[PDB]
Amino acid sequence: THIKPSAQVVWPIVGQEILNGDVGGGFQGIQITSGFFQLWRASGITSELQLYSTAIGGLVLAAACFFAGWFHYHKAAPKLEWFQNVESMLNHHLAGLLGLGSLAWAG
Amino acid sequence: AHVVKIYDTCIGCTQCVRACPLDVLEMVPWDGCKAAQMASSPRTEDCVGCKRCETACPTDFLSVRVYLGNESTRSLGLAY
Amino acid sequence: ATEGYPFVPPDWAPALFVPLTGLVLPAVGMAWAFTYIQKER
Amino acid sequence: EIGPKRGSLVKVLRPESYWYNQVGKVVSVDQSGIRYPVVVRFENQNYAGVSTNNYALDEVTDPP
Amino acid sequence: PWKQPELDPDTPSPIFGGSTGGLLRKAQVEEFYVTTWESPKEQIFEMPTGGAAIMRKGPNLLKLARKEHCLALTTQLRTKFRMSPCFYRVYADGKVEYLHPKDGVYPEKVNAGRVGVNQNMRSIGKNVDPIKVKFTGSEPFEI
Amino acid sequence: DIAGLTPCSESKAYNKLERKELKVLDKRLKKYEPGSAPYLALQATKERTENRFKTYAKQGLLCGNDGLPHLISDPGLALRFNHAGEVFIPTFGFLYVAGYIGHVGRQYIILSKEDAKPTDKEIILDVPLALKLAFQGWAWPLASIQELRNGSLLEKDENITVSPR
Amino acid sequence: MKDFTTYLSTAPVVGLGWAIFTSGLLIEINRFFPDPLVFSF
Amino acid sequence: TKLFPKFSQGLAQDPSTRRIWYGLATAHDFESHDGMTEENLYQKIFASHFGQLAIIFLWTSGNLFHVAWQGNFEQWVTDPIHVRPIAHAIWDPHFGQPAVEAFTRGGASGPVNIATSGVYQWWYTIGLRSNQELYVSSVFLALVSAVFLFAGWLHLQPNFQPSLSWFKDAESRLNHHLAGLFGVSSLAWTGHLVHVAIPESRGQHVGWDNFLSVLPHPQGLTPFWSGNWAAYAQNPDTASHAFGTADGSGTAILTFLGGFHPQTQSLWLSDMAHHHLAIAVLFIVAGHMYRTNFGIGHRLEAILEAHTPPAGGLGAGHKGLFHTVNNSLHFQLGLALASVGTITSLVAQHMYSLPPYAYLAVDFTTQASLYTHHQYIAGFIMCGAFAHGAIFFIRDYDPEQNKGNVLARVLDHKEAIISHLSWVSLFLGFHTLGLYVHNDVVQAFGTPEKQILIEPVFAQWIQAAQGKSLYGFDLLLASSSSPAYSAGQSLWLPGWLEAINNNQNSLFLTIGPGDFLVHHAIALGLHTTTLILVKGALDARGSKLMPDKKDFGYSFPCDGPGRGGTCDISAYDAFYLAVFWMLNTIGWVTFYWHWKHLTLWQGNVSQFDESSTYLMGWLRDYLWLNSSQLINGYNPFGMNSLSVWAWTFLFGHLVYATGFMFLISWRGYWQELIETLVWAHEKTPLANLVYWKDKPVALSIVQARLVGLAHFSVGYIFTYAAFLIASTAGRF
Numbered sequence A: 001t002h003i004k005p006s007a008q009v010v011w012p013i014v015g016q017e018i019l020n021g022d023v024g025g026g027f028q029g030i031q032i033t034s035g036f037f038q039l040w041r042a043s044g045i046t047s048e049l050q051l052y053s054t055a056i057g058g059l060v061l062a063a064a065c066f067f068a069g070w071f072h073y074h075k076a077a078p079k080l081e082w083f084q085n086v087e088s089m090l091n092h093h094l095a096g097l098l099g100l101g102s103l104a105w106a107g
Numbered sequence B: 001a002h003v004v005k006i007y008d009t010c011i012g013c014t015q016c017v018r019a020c021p022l023d024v025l026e027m028v029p030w031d032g033c034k035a036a037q038m039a040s041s042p043r044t045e046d047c048v049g050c051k052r053c054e055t056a057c058p059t060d061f062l063s064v065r066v067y068l069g070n071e072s073t074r075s076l077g078l079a080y
Numbered sequence C: 001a002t003e004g005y006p007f008v009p010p011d012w013a014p015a016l017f018v019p020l021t022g023l024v025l026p027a028v029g030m031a032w033a034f035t036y037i038q039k040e041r
Numbered sequence D: 001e002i003g004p005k006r007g008s009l010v011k012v013l014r015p016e017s018y019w020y021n022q023v024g025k026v027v028s029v030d031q032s033g034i035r036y037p038v039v040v041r042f043e044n045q046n047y048a049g050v051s052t053n054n055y056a057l058d059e060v061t062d063p064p
Numbered sequence E: 001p002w003k004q005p006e007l008d009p010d011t012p013s014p015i016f017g018g019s020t021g022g023l024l025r026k027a028q029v030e031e032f033y034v035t036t037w038e039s040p041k042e043q044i045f046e047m048p049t050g051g052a053a054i055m056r057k058g059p060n061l062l063k064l065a066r067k068e069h070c071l072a073l074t075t076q077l078r079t080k081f082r083m084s085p086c087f088y089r090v091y092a093d094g095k096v097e098y099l100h101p102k103d104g105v106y107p108e109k110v111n112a113g114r115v116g117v118n119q120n121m122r123s124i125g126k127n128v129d130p131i132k133v134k135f136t137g138s139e140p141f142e143i
Numbered sequence F: 001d002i003a004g005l006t007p008c009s010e011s012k013a014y015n016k017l018e019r020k021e022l023k024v025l026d027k028r029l030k031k032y033e034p035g036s037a038p039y040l041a042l043q044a045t046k047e048r049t050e051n052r053f054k055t056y057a058k059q060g061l062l063c064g065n066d067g068l069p070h071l072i073s074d075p076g077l078a079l080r081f082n083h084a085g086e087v088f089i090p091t092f093g094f095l096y097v098a099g100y101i102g103h104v105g106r107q108y109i110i111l112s113k114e115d116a117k118p119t120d121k122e123i124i125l126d127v128p129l130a131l132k133l134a135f136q137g138w139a140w141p142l143a144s145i146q147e148l149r150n151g152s153l154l155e156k157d158e159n160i161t162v163s164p165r
Numbered sequence G: 001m002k003d004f005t006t007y008l009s010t011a012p013v014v015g016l017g018w019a020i021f022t023s024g025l026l027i028e029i030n031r032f033f034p035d036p037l038v039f040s041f
Numbered sequence H: 001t002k003l004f005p006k007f008s009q010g011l012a013q014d015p016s017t018r019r020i021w022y023g024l025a026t027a028h029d030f031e032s033h034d035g036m037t038e039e040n041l042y043q044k045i046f047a048s049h050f051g052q053l054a055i056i057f058l059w060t061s062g063n064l065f066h067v068a069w070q071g072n073f074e075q076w077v078t079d080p081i082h083v084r085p086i087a088h089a090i091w092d093p094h095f096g097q098p099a100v101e102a103f104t105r106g107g108a109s110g111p112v113n114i115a116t117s118g119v120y121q122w123w124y125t126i127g128l129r130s131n132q133e134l135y136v137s138s139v140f141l142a143l144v145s146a147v148f149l150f151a152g153w154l155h156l157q158p159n160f161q162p163s164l165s166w167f168k169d170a171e172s173r174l175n176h177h178l179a180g181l182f183g184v185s186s187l188a189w190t191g192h193l194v195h196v197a198i199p200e201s202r203g204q205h206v207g208w209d210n211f212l213s214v215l216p217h218p219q220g221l222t223p224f225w226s227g228n229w230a231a232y233a234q235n236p237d238t239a240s241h242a243f244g245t246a247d248g249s250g251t252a253i254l255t256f257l258g259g260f261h262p263q264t265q266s267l268w269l270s271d272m273a274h275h276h277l278a279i280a281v282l283f284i285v286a287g288h289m290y291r292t293n294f295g296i297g298h299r300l301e302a303i304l305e306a307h308t309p310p311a312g313g314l315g316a317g318h319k320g321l322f323h324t325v326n327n328s329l330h331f332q333l334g335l336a337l338a339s340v341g342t343i344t345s346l347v348a349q350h351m352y353s354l355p356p357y358a359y360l361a362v363d364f365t366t367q368a369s370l371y372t373h374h375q376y377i378a379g380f381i382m383c384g385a386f387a388h389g390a391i392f393f394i395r396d397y398d399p400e401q402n403k404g405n406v407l408a409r410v411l412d413h414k415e416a417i418i419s420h421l422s423w424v425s426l427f428l429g430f431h432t433l434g435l436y437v438h439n440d441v442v443q444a445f446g447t448p449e450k451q452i453l454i455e456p457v458f459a460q461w462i463q464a465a466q467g468k469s470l471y472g473f474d475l476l477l478a479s480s481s482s483p484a485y486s487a488g489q490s491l492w493l494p495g496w497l498e499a500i501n502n503n504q505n506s507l508f509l510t511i512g513p514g515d516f517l518v519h520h521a522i523a524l525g526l527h528t529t530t531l532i533l534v535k536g537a538l539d540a541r542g543s544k545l546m547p548d549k550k551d552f553g554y555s556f557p558c559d560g561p562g563r564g565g566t567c568d569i570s571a572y573d574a575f576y577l578a579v580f581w582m583l584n585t586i587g588w589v590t591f592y593w594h595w596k597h598l599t600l601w602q603g604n605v606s607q608f609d610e611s612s613t614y615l616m617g618w619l620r621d622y623l624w625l626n627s628s629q630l631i632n633g634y635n636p637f638g639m640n641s642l643s644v645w646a647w648t649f650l651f652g653h654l655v656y657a658t659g660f661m662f663l664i665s666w667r668g669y670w671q672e673l674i675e676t677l678v679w680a681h682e683k684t685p686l687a688n689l690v691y692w693k694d695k696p697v698a699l700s701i702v703q704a705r706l707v708g709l710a711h712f713s714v715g716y717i718f719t720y721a722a723f724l725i726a727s728t729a730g731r732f
């Protein structure tokens, strides 16, 4: 209630030291507006170590997704009938994606 | 209506008459080109001035020229 | 009057002249122009 | 026979042409006596996108 | 063509529902256009002003408000089913005009039977300046 | 003391602006402990501000009625009075680089136009030749002068596309 | 490497290499030297 | 077939709504009218010029009548510094009870409108004192307007219609207009000044009853017939002189003191008296130059053909140009509009610095409105000059008539001129925006000393050359040893130096780096507008994209989507895009004038000096600080006198927004929307009985550009006029 959120720190290169505003808590930087501190307080997150672990896991999953795109195009590309299975796509993205994510977040 | 004129630079590619969706242009025999064809515009009063023939014209400059002015009930593309 | 002979208009003239040129003269203008445009030869 | 040599570079002096005061390569010259028998090809396209055009005998000269 | 054909009111029409795109009051006070084609079977075509309709096996009749609609339908039919159709023009007083195949061989051909019209033997850009034709009533390209 | 402008060293408004900046910078110093990284950054900012205010003074700089330094643009007036460093030498400093860029671009344009299908060289650059011209453009004015003199810089209008008016 | 270095000589050699070089160059002049106004060497 | 476009039979055959708009738009384009010759065209232009003269005289007669009727001219005469001018009374039946109560300004009874046109100061300076004289002026100007009406009708009947060659008589026209329209007209004006205004400023009423009984100078024309012209400049008005009474006055009719009146802050009456007398004499002398029926004189064709420099400097020189200017009416129109716009700019730049009317400088809002009005008028007139020059180039330019002359040679290297204009415009804009953004982001970082403040040494050097001793440049006219100061040291130097060394007036204000930066912005706007207008004029008849532009008329929409796309390819669209740049440029010059003068009047010139450098300071201290009183015209708490200006402000915003409506969207989507509306009207009950006679058709592309430009311009003008007069009238 007294310390403004801040998650972007500018460099002291040219006149930007005035942009590192006194957001409180012995810290200076850009007062952020995305509400990420509120989200990281909703999901139980205490230290910056857990944020570091989340960042590393996100980078790993991003590399996995890029490798998945490369594989699913260049290496093993699905046929047209695979994409035309609309019922399977709807079932797997209703029960699987949305429902499994909702259950995992509830847990 | 509008004025559509065809100059002697035409070489008879007979594609300006395909690009015109109003049957304004026609192909007549000629002797000034290798293809022995020349664009002619008998139904000039039916033209709206869409300049599709000028787009389809390959000669530089354009053999078929369309000049705007004196709009009518057929040159304005009016169905009402 | 002391040389009011370059005739001074009355102090009630706006009440007659403003609606005359705001309501009647535009009406005559629209009617005359609309008769002009829709005239076949 | 009546025009420039095939494959020789010529200069176009037609004012309304896109290639006025430009150099083009002759690809064919018609011998049937037509209005614009000289056919040339230009390395740069016009605004319409074409690269070839036809000119008369008096509209082509040897560039210096 | 060899003989100019007259349109027949007895030819049927393709099956189509009510479309708001179609004939207007201009079809009454002014001229309107009628397209005629012969089909070997029942096919589905898209109207230039509406949705999709099924043509009849044989002669067909379509009434369109503009000549551009008729030629768009003609080009669509020629590209799709090589129909080679023809369209007319019916005036308000009942006069029927023949427009598209005047020679019967389409504007793409020549037929060696049509004269040159609105053709300038001079080059484009060799026209005189507007000062030379000022106060004359004739444009430089109209010479 | 030209154009009614006092020197920056002997200007009261310049010192007023300096002490106002020092005051507003020291206002933020009271909210951090002296052994903190934001305190170190603010101290570095204050040191940079003091160094800038010191170096702008006694450097042939003038300011008038506002405390903000002014620049003298007329050459000659920047020569007899010590003001050439404002715009006189940096004009040639910019012009050298501008002619460098133009000359290396011109060299690449000529050396690419003499190659088969030369339109691809603009989207597909070559690095060795462009770097060779990049390190050969130091003497751009001499090359430009000699090319103007021999006539290869310009081209005959006869060979230039001209609007047909 | 031939196919890769043919791609690397397209748009990023002029859009990224020049941009990064000229930028970071100018950043380091503006960093190591303070903000100048008069060219007094 | 209709008959509303009687001038255009083809337009009357148009069955759509486009016929009305095109007939209104091509109303006075006589060169494109059906079946019209040159002589009838010239006679029609003569009658039209008579009509505009009658309209102008009727309008100024109405101004006199309304000021004499509902104004406070007598109260303004008694107290000019306190009593405000009144333009006309307000009779709006939609007004509320507070609205009537909030517009009885100037010590009036009913709702009145405060006059900022400057006619009160002008009429007080020229000797008009009572509303009786203004009434007589109004009725006389109405009479001469009727005379011009009858004369315009007179030169349309047979045996009275002038021939074509009468209009083409150039030498006699120039002789007569320069001798009488300028010379003897200025002589009559300085005679009126000496007879009426000089005694009326010294408590001596001169009217029609007694001007033959009073004498303008105590010597009485003896100096004029003799040589002793210095008797007129013997006893001028002293410094402690009142413009209404004869307190400390003198008997002088022609004097050259210079400077300003110490009380009225305006130029001396004897100064402008000798000015108009000298101008009259010089113009009458210059009016006896060109060749007429007598054996002496100058021939314009001979001078044009003779001025061909040797060695082919200009090729054929000005050979063949006399027939080019005489035959082409658009050339003469463009030259006249160019000179008129340039001299309107000169009038705007010289009125505020040298006020010729008593107590005009005290009225700040009036001076601001006058400057803004005449500057926008000048910009529009210059845009019209370049547009009509383009019309000359495409319509009636004959290259074989003048081969190798200056015109054909300029058209030959038109690409070089356009490219160099593009270079200077691009360079000015690049570096001006670069320095503005640099200074603005430097001021953002809390270090305003790092901004680039290039001192305007050139213009300050010029000001010191004119006698301004503030900058310390001891040049000529500022040092006592210079010959320019010694020459005229006893003529007008003590007045001019006293007026130019006083910073309270607007004569040669002190200029800082922000002044120089906004001057460069002004030069950028002028250069870019010149670039686009020049490129449109030179490419009006031919281009590499379209060589046959001369065959398509001056105002045609496009050539189609072929050859890449040819939208806005005509010179008409070049003018249409140039009007935006003209509006932006005059907006820049008026922003500069208004902010500098507002900071001068409020006394904080340092605020403008330290705030005009960066654009954020410009915005905050001009468009935000000065708009506080404007938008408080009608609060929910209450309404004041500035309620009309806030409504006009939002009105101009709305009209500018409708200009955007016509400008962004283009015709072709509106045609389908209108077609759907046509189907809606044709296929509904109780409304298909009512049917249009003109077919509804969307606005043409040229028409779309015209209406978008028109809405944009009127909205621009109205919102800026509202803001300017509200910010200058809210405080003073």
Ligand code: CLA
Residues within 6 Å of the ligand: C009, C013, C014, C015, C017, C018, C019, C021, C022, H055, H058, H059, H061, H062, H063, H065, H066, H070, H088, H089, H090, H091, H142
């Ligand atoms: C053309 C210049 C001009 C303009 C813009 C105005 C503007 C105004 N006048 Mg004024 N007026 C003028 C000239 C003008 N006047 C002249 C010359 C006279 C003396 C004959 C008057 C006599 C007059 C009276 C008596 C009254 C106004 C009023 C008004 C206001 C309401 C508008 C109105 O009713 O029109 C005025 C309508 C009239 C019929 C009078 C004008 C007669 C015209 C000028 C003669 C016709 C000339 C020509 C054929 C048509 C002119 C159009 C032309 C400009 C294109 C408005 C502020 C009224 C008001 O409330 O005062 C503020 C009012 O009561 N006017």
Ligand code: CLA
Residues within 6 Å of the ligand: H306, H307, H308, H309, H310, H312, H313, H314, H317
């Ligand atoms: C001492 C020798 C001398 C000199 C210096 C001149 C000088 C001049 N004479 Mg000449 N003259 C001389 C002897 C001389 N004269 C003699 C002995 C005779 C015989 C009696 C003449 C007869 C003569 C005639 C008959 C004429 C001249 C003219 C001229 C002028 C133009 C010359 C020219 O070709 O245009 C200069 C050459 C050009 C190619 C013009 C280029 C202009 C560029 C393109 C414009 C650049 C615009 C630029 C953007 C502006 C930027 C400004 C910025 C604020 C934006 C020039 C001032 C002409 C004149 O009166 O014009 C004023 C003319 O008609 N002369």
Ligand code: CLA
Residues within 6 Å of the ligand: H422, H423, H425, H426, H427, H428, H429, H430, H433, H524, H528, H531, H532, H577, H578, H580, H581
């Ligand atoms: C306020 C808005 C605005 C601005 C800034 C411009 C700016 C410009 N217009 Mg204009 N224009 C505008 C509104 C505007 N226009 C409108 C509303 C119209 C009516 C349609 C026109 C009509 C118009 C015409 C008809 C013409 C221009 C021309 C020009 C140029 C004039 C040359 C100049 O001054 O130097 C340059 C001025 C600048 C402001 C430079 C802008 C570029 C800066 C440096 C940023 C560059 C990118 C930056 C480094 C960041 C990189 C990353 C980023 C790209 C993502 C310039 C590019 C003329 C032209 O282009 O010919 C030379 C021209 O003929 N304009």
Ligand code: CLA
Residues within 6 Å of the ligand: A061, A065, A082, A083, A085, A086, A088, A089, A092, A093, A095, A096, A097
């Ligand atoms: C229950 C099974 C399941 C799940 C969970 C998903 C999940 C997803 N699919 Mg789907 N899909 C499925 C089965 C499934 N799919 C089936 C059976 C078919 C064929 C009928 C398809 C066909 C299909 C198409 C055609 C497309 C998708 C896409 C997507 C993504 C949508 C983007 C989104 O909402 O952001 C949610 C994003 C995240 C949660 C980020 C994490 C993503 C992780 C790494 C994915 C893990 C789920 C995966 C099924 C695990 C097994 C893969 C295994 C081989 C390693 C999402 C990741 C879109 C896509 O390409 O994105 C990949 C897309 O266009 N799906």
Ligand code: CLA
Residues within 6 Å of the ligand: F101, F102, F103, F104, F105, F106, F108, F130, F131, F133, F134, H419, H420, H422, H423, H426
């Ligand atoms: C290096 C190539 C090059 C050269 C020598 C020129 C030279 C010229 N141009 Mg051109 N220009 C170029 C590239 C170039 N231009 C590019 C890429 C563009 C597109 C953005 C333009 C757009 C342009 C316009 C719109 C105008 C000019 C104008 C001019 C003239 C004024 C000088 C100037 O600084 O203009 C200013 C030039 C610019 C603002 C363009 C800057 C773009 C960068 C710096 C070019 C990058 C090229 C690259 C570094 C070369 C590759 C190097 C090689 C080793 C690989 C001059 C004839 C003006 C004119 O006609 O005056 C006579 C004019 O109005 N130019």
Ligand code: CLA
Residues within 6 Å of the ligand: H024, H025, H026, H027, H028, H029, H030, H333, H337, H380, H381, H383, H384, H385, H387, H388, H391, H554, H555, H572, H575, H710, H711, H714
């Ligand atoms: C005294 C100078 C003068 C003269 C004699 C002419 C005369 C002519 N010009 Mg020129 N012109 C002038 C000034 C002048 N104009 C100015 C100042 C401009 C710049 C704005 C132009 C721009 C211009 C262009 C671009 C063109 C002409 C054309 C014409 C011709 C017919 C125009 C006409 O009457 O249409 C009558 C027009 C109308 C009745 C429309 C009036 C709508 C106005 C202009 C918009 C005003 C905005 C708004 C609605 C005003 C009311 C505000 C509201 C709140 C009350 C004629 C040869 C045209 C031509 O030669 O044809 C090819 C042409 O293309 N001129």
Ligand SMILES: CC1=C(/C=C/C(C)=C/C=C/C(C)=C/C=C/C=C(C)/C=C/C=C(C)/C=C/C2=C(C)CCCC2(C)C)C(C)(C)CCC1
Residues within 6 Å of the ligand: H330, H331, H332, H333, H334, H335, H338, H342, H382, H385, H386, H387, H388, H389, H390, H392, H393, H534, H537
């Ligand atoms: C398009 C065209 C046109 C138009 C144009 C224009 C519109 C222009 C304008 C122009 C302009 C607008 C110009 C201006 C100019 C100016 C000047 C040229 C000035 C000068 C000045 C001076 C020379 C001064 C001097 C002085 C004195 C006297 C005093 C003080 C000092 C001094 C020394 C400064 C025309 C019609 C022809 C036709 C063709 C085409």
Ligand code: SF4
Residues within 6 Å of the ligand: B006, B009, B010, B011, B012, B013, B014, B015, B016, B017, B039, B053, B056, B057, B058, B059, B062, B063, B064
């Ligand atoms: S498109 Fe042009 S060149 Fe081709 S056949 Fe038609 S008129 Fe001739």
Ligand code: SF4
Residues within 6 Å of the ligand: B004, B019, B020, B021, B022, B023, B024, B025, B046, B047, B048, B049, B050, B051, B052, B053, B054, B066
């Ligand atoms: S403008 Fe259109 S309708 Fe007219 S002749 Fe050309 S292609 Fe046909």
